[PDB]
Swiss-Prot record, chains A, B, C, D, E, F:
The keyword Transcription appears for this protein: no
Known outcome of mutating R11A: Absence of tautomerase activity using 2-hydroxymuconate. For 2-hydroxy-2,4-pentadienoate and phenylenolpyruvate, a strong decrease of catalytic efficiency and a 2-fold decrease of affinity is observed
Protein name: 2-hydroxymuconate tautomerase
Enzyme class: isomerase
Homology family: Belongs to the 4-oxalocrotonate tautomerase family.
Taxonomic lineage from the root: Bacteria, Bacillati, Bacillota, Bacilli, Bacillales
Function: Catalyzes both 1,3- and 1,5-keto-enol tautomerization of the diacid 2-hydroxymuconate (2-hydroxy-2,4-hexadienedioate) to produce 2-oxo-4-hexenedioate. This reaction is highly stereoselective and produces a mixture of stereoisomers, where the (3S)-isomer of 2-oxo-4-hexenedioate predominates. Also catalyzes the tautomerization of 2-hydroxymuconate to 2-oxo-3-hexenedioate, however this reaction is slower and occurs after the tautomerization of 2-hydroxymuconate to 2-oxo-4-hexenedioate.
Residues annotated as the enzyme's active site: P1 (proton acceptor)
Domain of life of the source: Bacteria
Pfam families, per the entry: Tautomerase
């Protein structure tokens, strides 16, 4: 199983390590997937490259 | 945050429900994001559309 | 440029035609790119493959 | 609806803000999607990471 | 490495097998990666879900 | 056809140029796709953003 996590910049390296740990476990136990088969990708977004309702987060409070 | 889980066809509806649930909690507790801001996409693959070492799974003997 | 639009199943063929058209003009007029260089991909999701706050849409009551 | 716009580096911050505005509107009116439900991601490509017909744009005039 | 090939529906099963094989060798010999570390995903599009210059292929005359 | 190659940072600019050449050829001959229709994207991953079996490569030997 391939898991891609897309989130905004601003997380600690530790939060990222925990994210991978937790997410991998969540997948292992709910899908019966073998652990060495679970891959995780982290993709960080820039507030000026992410919008909702027509407004980029870089243009918001 | 946005989580996309890509895995082979086959999981039961229940397994998928648990995946979404578990994966969402794993994100929530590990990044600080709030539930209504956590989105999960499920993408299923066919054994004949997924290959490793030049061999599609469907062609593995 | 490449534009991928991911949305739930349900739109009519007409709606999709308008999406491609409108979205392409929006790109053309806003980035300077030329029409034959603008590509649009449409990706449809199932309510049981899309979740928010740990709940797939198909499971929302 | 989730819209990903993949384009080359070289656009102004204003062009990007307009892109998000225009594209969000194009989607709102052609798909009947609620505005606060329309998300836009901008992904910039490097000429040395984008090829056509076997030649990277970084290796062209 | 992970290679995703996105193309229109239509290729034969044989063509797909050759794609995976050829593409994998091309990666192996050009990046140094080892075969069991090279993954290929095949994604097929519908002519009515792919557009160029504001015109879906299915609508081209 | 659109080919995305996702691999770790650490490859020479030459290896990347060869990758695009080889991969484009592999696709041209196995799918009957016209050369000017074959597009290649290179996406580099950071070891601290790529995990396998719950452990990020940045946390491994």
């Amino acid at each position: 199983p391939y898991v891609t996590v897309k989130m905004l910049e601003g997380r600690t390296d530790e939060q990222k390590r925990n994210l991978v740990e937790k997410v991998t476990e969540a997948v292992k136990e709910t899908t019966g997937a073998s652990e060495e088969k679970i891959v995780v990708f982290i993709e960080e977004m820039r507030k000026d490259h992410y919008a909702v309702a027509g407004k980029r987060l870089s243009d918001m409070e």
